[PDB]
């Protein structure tokens, strides 16, 4: 039972907002990554129990996944786009820290991150 609670996707006191940038993040960035062939392992938290990776949450203390990001965006959890961008970067970084280069998961993260960076370059409010 080595899985933590997942990251919060709502919070009573944290102020909530919808900006054009946050709409772009849900409707274009998340949408393109979510439907990518390599999205699926990132669509929910890492299941250290199911994967038999009992040390995952010993090593990764700031977990993040796209399921979480998607719910945060749908819930207007974020105040600004930078918060969301930060979550995507945390997701990628965690994957690169925990796994070794040439692991399939790392190659999947690299392909998603390329696409992420391309979509982030067109972020509106321009």
Residues that bind ligand E0K (CB under 6 A): 41-42, 46, 51, 53, 95, 98-99, 104-105, 108
Name the residue number minimizing CB distance to ligand E0K.
41
78, 64 in Cβ contact below 8 A?
no
Question: Whole-angstrom Cα distance, residue 57 to residue 42?
Answer: 16
Residue 56 Cβ, how far from ligand E0K at the closest point, in Å? 6
Report the alpha-carbon distance of residue 33 to residue 37 in Å, rounded: 9
Report the candidate in 65, 54, 118, 111 with the shortest Cα–Cα distance to residue 87: 65
Q: Kindly state the smallest distance separating residue 113's Cβ from ligand E0K, in Å.
A: 12
Cβ 122 to ligand E0K, closest distance in Å? 25
Q: Which is nearer to ligand E0K, 8 or 104 (CB)?
A: 104
- Which residue lies nearer to ligand E0K by CB, 76 or 93? 93
**Can you spell out the DSSP letters for 65-110?**
-HHHHHHHHHHT--SSHHHHHHHHHHHHHHHHHHSPTTSHHHHHHH
Q: Which is nearer to ligand E0K, 13 or 50 (CB)?
A: 50
Q: In terms of CB distance, is 53 or 120 closer to ligand E0K?
A: 53
- Nearest approach in angstroms of CB 45 to ligand E0K is 9
Q: How far apart are CA 64 and CA 108, in angstroms?
A: 16
């Amino acid at each position: 039972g080595s899985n933590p609670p997942p990251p919060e996707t709502s919070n009573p006191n944290k102020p909530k907002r919808q900006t054009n940038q946050l709409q772009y993040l849900l409707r274009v960035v998340l949408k393109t990554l979510w439907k990518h062939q390599f999205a699926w392992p990132f669509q929910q938290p890492v299941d250290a129990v199911k994967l038999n990776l009992p040390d995952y949450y010993k090593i990764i203390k700031t977990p993040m996944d796209m399921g979480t990001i998607k719910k945060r965006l749908e819930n207007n959890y974020y105040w600004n786009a930078q918060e969301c961008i930060q979550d995507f970067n945390t997701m990628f970084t965690n994957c690169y820290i925990y796994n070794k280069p040439g692991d399939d998961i790392v190659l999947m993260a690299e392909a998603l991150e390329k696409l992420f960076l391309q979509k982030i370059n067109e972020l509106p409010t321009e």
